[model samples]
Target: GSSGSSGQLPSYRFNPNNHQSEQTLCVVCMCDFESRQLLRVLPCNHEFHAKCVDKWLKANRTCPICRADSGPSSG
Candidate 1:
């Protein structure tokens, strides 16, 4: 599942030993399904990358995690 179209949503691959890979959501930056590490799950139960969330917050105040205010922010 590591190989796919760039930025395409990946299908979840579960293994017995991986705890972080277990499905969860980041409330401050809402998205389900993680395929890599450094996933940031927030207090609101949303998720994002530490980097991605930073950039998103810089550009907009709400959550890309929830698509909360993305319309003008989507440049």
Candidate 2:
């Protein structure tokens, strides 16, 4: 059986705007997103570093910042 690859994880893309804010760091890892790294956007529109979020998703199933269900459900 699949370990955790059962449904849609989240939307992701490169930080095209190269955006940064006071809270730009990945909530899960507390690290700033590098220019070359990918970002995962949650349904709540919160963004996180791909690697950090992926690891978080494996252990938990919700947005770190907002406790929103990060399940494999459709929009």
Candidate 3:
């Protein structure tokens, strides 16, 4: 529910194609999603590939794009 933060982790749920389908364009990858691989939905209403985002957080503690803190909680 992208309408607003729904108290959901990351507060951003992708408008997947259907009930059991997800979108291909990863906001973090900036490219067509490779597979239904691991998805690390962040707290800043941002989504990313687990590998891509995890590596980033290792170096920086914030959302790659929003610069929001990558910690336990966010508002």
**Each model's TM-score?**
0.38, 0.64, 0.55
Candidate 3 lDDT, tens digit per residue, 21-69? Answer: 3433555568544434556676655567766665666677677777887
Candidate 3 runs further than 4 Å off: 1-16, 19-28, 73-75
By TM-score: ranked, best first: 2, 3, 1
Best by lDDT: 2
Displacement of the residue 11 alpha carbon in candidate 3, Å: 14
lDDT of each: 0.49, 0.69, 0.56
**Cα error of candidate 3 at position 34, Å:** 4.5
What is the lDDT for 32 in model 3? 45
List candidate 1 stretches off by more than 4 Å.
Answer: 1-36, 67-75
Total residue pair clashes for candidate 1 = 8
Which is the winner by lDDT between candidate 1 and candidate 3? 3
Inter-residue clash pairs, candidate 2: none
